[PDB]
Design a protein around this nucleic acid. Structure first.
Ligand SMILES: [Ca+2]
Ligand SMILES: [Ca+2]
Ligand SMILES: [Ca+2]
Ligand code: NA
Length: 223
DNA sequence: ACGCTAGGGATAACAGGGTAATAC
DNA sequence: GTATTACCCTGTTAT
DNA sequence: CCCTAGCGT
């Protein structure tokens, strides 16, 4: 059986590579559960072949987090993270890291959790039936943050930046978070867009749910 | 005065596109 | 040539 | 995502 070591440097259309590919069938449990939070978060899952296969693309400022994720998806990620340096329209140097898994049907299982009537979307009940505490940890490390950033502040309220989802979508997400994890939360408008507000009242419950999965370098997002 | 908020800005993300490296 | 496709790349903001 | 000006008390 081919070893990652043997194809991580071959051409994309290489036979040896495709063999290693066929030796893989499905994502392992962590890869799947964490996958939910990442897709809800900063990751990007795409298909270039009408749903035959999907790969996940990653891009983060924090290198530590990037390396944590690549390691989590180890067997699906051939190359180390690539450094991306660009200039804004303000002539400013912004640094980020990029990486991605190769495409594979193993990813269809994750992708599908977000397609209904044939469109990318957030299903009512995604939370209820699939979002595990691990899922929540990654969603938090990705789009989570504090409500009050003022220094010395004592507000424990939390926020999930869901500004790219529809209000109805976030509305469904909130229902699932309340019902499934008894989190005192609700939708709030920001720049005419939806974010999830998690009352400080439930901070400790929220915290105890994701605590096991967050890494040292993400601990700063917590109040 | 001080704690919230919502308003706001410069990213730190998300989305797609293009091609050098294999196959036949 | 034509078909593949992982690893960059740039377009653009919602975060 | 974070910051912070300035409303509300
Ligand atoms: Ca997001
Ligand atoms: Ca993030
Ligand atoms: Ca975005
Ligand atoms: Na994000």
């Amino acid at each position: 059986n081919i070893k990652k070591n043997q194809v991580m440097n071959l051409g994309p259309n290489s036979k040896l590579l495709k063999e290693y590919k066929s030796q893989l069938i499905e994502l392992n449990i962590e890869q799947f559960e964490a996958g939910i939070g990442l897709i809800l978060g900063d990751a990007y899952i795409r298909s270039r072949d009408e749903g035959k296969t999907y790969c996940m693309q990653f891009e983060w400022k924090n290198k530590a987090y990037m390396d944590h994720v690549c390691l989590l998806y180890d067997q699906w990620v051939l190359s180390p993270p690539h450094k991306k340096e660009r200039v804004n329209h303000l002539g400013n140097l912004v640094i980020t890291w990029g990486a991605q898994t190769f495409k594979h049907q193993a990813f269809n299982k994750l992708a599908n959790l977000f397609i209904v009537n044939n469109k990318k979307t957030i299903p009512n009940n995604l939370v209820e039936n699939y979002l595990t505490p691990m899922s929540l940890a990654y969603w938090f490390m990705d789009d989570g943050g504090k409500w009050d950033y003022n220094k010395n502040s004592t507000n424990k309220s939390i926020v999930l930046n869901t500004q790219s989802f529809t209000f109805e979508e976030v509305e469904y997400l909130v229902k699932g978070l309340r019902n499934k994890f008894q989190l005192n939360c609700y939708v709030k408008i920001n720049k005419n867009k939806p974010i999830i507000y998690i009352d400080s009242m439930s901070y400790l419950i929220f915290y105890n749910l994701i605590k096991p999965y967050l890494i040292p370098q993400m601990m700063y997002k917590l109040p």
